[PDB]
Amino acid sequence: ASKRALVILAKGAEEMETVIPVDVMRRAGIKVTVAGLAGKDPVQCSRDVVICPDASLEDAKKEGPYDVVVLPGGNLGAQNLSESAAVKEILKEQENRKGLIAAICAGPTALLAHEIGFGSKVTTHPLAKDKMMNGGHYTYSENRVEKDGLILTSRGPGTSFEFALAIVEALNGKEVAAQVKAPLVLK
Amino acid sequence: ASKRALVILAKGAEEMETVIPVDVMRRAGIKVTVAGLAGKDPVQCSRDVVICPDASLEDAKKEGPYDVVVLPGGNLGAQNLSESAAVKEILKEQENRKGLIAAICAGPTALLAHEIGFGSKVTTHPLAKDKMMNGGHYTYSENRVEKDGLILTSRGPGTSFEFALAIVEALNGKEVAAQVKAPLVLK
Ligand SMILES: *[C@@]1(=O)C(=O)[N]C2=C(C(F)(F)F)[C]=[C][C]=C21
Ligand SMILES: *[C@@]1(=O)C(=O)[N]C2=C(C(F)(F)F)[C]=[C][C]=C21
Ligand SMILES: [Cl-]
Ligand SMILES: [Cl-]
């Protein structure tokens, strides 16, 4: 059976951090659901790219659980994710079932907000470190992609391909990740 | 006055090659218009990401000319660009006025279709080389980003940041490109 990914899309999401993982995961044969936090309607991303989600979060939740829950960054997107009780419930469920949770840039700060994965080694965007580290609930890393326990994190738009390929490797294996990587013309 | 970019968005465009340049150019303070080839309606990209354009191409043309015309790739997107008389007119105008033309992945093959920039050194995705080189009208390059005469080309999703930053440098200068680059966490 194909692996399944939930990508939660909120107003102010970083569009590159949303699109790169969606696209790369789909190249890997993962069934990806782009789920609108606010509902079914189009979402205005951080740099004004407007993306139409596949489904509302409310509806996508009914079709869970997923092999990975993905939290894009963007400061205001991450803040919206952090404020959402629906996100909290999804992440708690995913944590309880020992499923992969992936977050990039400021996205990991929603893990802090929802008390997810405490004790894990994590990275974030450099400018989101202090927020993430408030209380010392995680151990900070400067690796471009980091993975500890359930929790896969990464730093910014420029680490999005590495982040996405790490998700691919976790779900579908090293060989599929290498096959998907080659045609991308990565450095 | 701010520089202005036209990004032409067709069905089957590679969404990463569309979003990365739009976002990075907007970070650079460029006024970017995402123009729908087919009209005002949302566009289904190659990997099923749906993007709502800012305007139809028809309308965006009325607001030209632009400092750069950008052609994303995606094989089927590039084919749609190649078949369009409206694209032909836009590119011919841009060429006639000695303005920048930028194209990535299979995007450069639309330049061939519309007889734009013959004689220039160009790159493409490796799998689009033979198409681009039919007739020997260009000189082929394996550089990740190439620039000759009016024509700025690049290879694939994994060269999209380099491509976008080259556009930024051409329009806004080296200093702005470096300022925009740093927070991206590129390697
Ligand atoms: C990143 O996408 C994010 O979530 N925050 C962020 C910043 C910051 F934190 F706002 F400064 C900068 C670049 C990229 C990202
Ligand atoms: C690229 O985005 C493009 O336009 N074509 C392409 C391929 C190809 F050519 F179809 F094989 C592969 C990867 C990336 C791109
Ligand atoms: Cl942001
Ligand atoms: Cl393609």
Curated annotation (Swiss-Prot), chains A, B:
The modification N6-succinyllysine is found at K181. Changing C105S: Loss of protein and nucleic acid deglycase activity. No effect on mitochondrial translocation. Reduced protease activity. No effect on protection against metal cytotoxicity. No effect on methylglyoxal-adducted glutathione or CoA. The active site is at C105, H125. It is a lipid-anchor. One of its GO terms (cellular component) is PML body. Keywords: Acetylation, Autophagy, Cell membrane, Chaperone, Copper, Cytoplasm, Disease variant, DNA damage, DNA repair, Endoplasmic reticulum, Fertilization, Hydrolase, Inflammatory response, Isopeptide bond, Lipoprotein, Membrane, Mitochondrion, Neurodegeneration, Nucleus, Oxidation, Palmitate, Parkinson disease, Parkinsonism, Phosphoprotein, Protease, RNA-binding, Stress response, Tumor suppressor, Ubl conjugation, Zymogen. Changing K129R: Partially compensates for loss of stability. It comes from the Eukaryota. The modification N6-acetyllysine is found at K147. Changing E162K: In PARK7; uncertain significance; no effect on detoxification activity on methylglyocal-adducted CoA. Highly expressed in pancreas, kidney, skeletal muscle, liver, testis and heart. Detected at slightly lower levels in placenta and brain (at protein level). Detected in astrocytes, Sertoli cells, spermatogonia, spermatids and spermatozoa. Expressed by pancreatic islets at higher levels than surrounding exocrine tissues. GO terms for biological process: adult locomotory behavior; androgen receptor signaling pathway; autophagy; cellular detoxification of aldehyde; cellular detoxification of methylglyoxal; cellular response to glyoxal; cellular response to hydrogen peroxide; cellular response to oxidative stress. Changing A178T: No effect on detoxification activity on methylglyocal-adducted CoA. One of its GO terms (molecular function) is ubiquitin-protein transferase inhibitor activity. The modification N-acetylalanine is found at A1. Sumoylated on Lys-129 by PIAS2 or PIAS4; which is enhanced after ultraviolet irradiation and essential for cell-growth promoting activity and transforming activity. Cys-105 is easily oxidized to sulfinic acid. Pfam families: DJ-1_PfpI. Changing C45S: No effect on mitochondrial translocation neither on deglycase activity. The keyword Lipoprotein applies. SUPFAM superfamilies: Class I glutamine amidotransferase-like. It is linked to Parkinson disease 7: A neurodegenerative disorder characterized by resting tremor, postural tremor, bradykinesia, muscular rigidity, anxiety and psychotic episodes. PARK7 has onset before 40 years, slow progression and initial good response to levodopa. Some patients may show traits reminiscent of amyotrophic lateral sclerosis-parkinsonism/dementia complex (Guam disease). Belongs to the peptidase C56 family. This is Parkinson disease protein 7.
